[PDB]
């Protein structure tokens, strides 16, 4: 369960969920953007918490490599990295997160 698994991991429940989200359970950004989220498509999405992983850091790693940045949340919606909490909740207010959301099919 080292890097390059965990990079496999990621791409593949990014490719296979519409909306999904790398959070960890105290985190004030994640709230941030499942709020954001919720606005539109509350218990309906994909949160995978990293603070009980025993390859946490090998994720956060992973993520890093995927996405630019290795901090949660890392929200990815259509396959697409969107951005962290600030971004999510950025494109709720602004109607672009209700776009994304339809022409991802969820929503
Ligand atoms: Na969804
Ligand atoms: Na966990």
Same mark, same amino acid.
């Given at each position: 369960?080292?890097?390059?698994?965990?990079?496999?991991? !990621?791409?593949?429940? @990014?490719?296979?969920?519409? @909306?999904?989200?790398? #959070?960890? &359970?105290?985190?004030?950004?994640? @709230?941030?953007?499942?709020?954001?989220?919720?606005?539109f498509?509350? /218990?309906?999405? &994909?949160?995978?918490?990293?603070? %009980? *992983?025993?390859?946490?850091?090998?994720?956060?790693?992973?993520?890093?490599? !995927?996405? /630019? /940045? *290795? #901090? @949660?949340? *890392?929200?990815?919606? %259509?396959?697409?990295?969107?951005?962290? /909490?600030?971004? &999510?909740?950025?494109?709720?207010? %602004?109607?672009?997160?209700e776009?994304?959301?339809?022409?991802?099919?969820?929503?």
């Amino acid at each position: 369960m080292g890097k390059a698994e965990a990079i496999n991991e !990621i791409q593949k429940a @990014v490719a296979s969920n519409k @909306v999904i989200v790398y #959070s960890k &359970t105290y985190c004030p950004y994640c @709230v941030k953007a499942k709020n954001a989220l919720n606005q539109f498509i509350a /218990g309906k999405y &994909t949160v995978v918490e990293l603070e %009980n *992983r025993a390859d946490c850091d090998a994720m956060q790693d992973a993520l890093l490599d !995927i996405t /630019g /940045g *290795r #901090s @949660v949340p *890392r929200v990815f919606i %259509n396959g697409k990295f969107l951005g962290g /909490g600030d971004d &999510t909740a950025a494109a709720a207010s %602004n109607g672009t997160l209700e776009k994304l959301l339809q022409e991802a099919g969820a929503l």
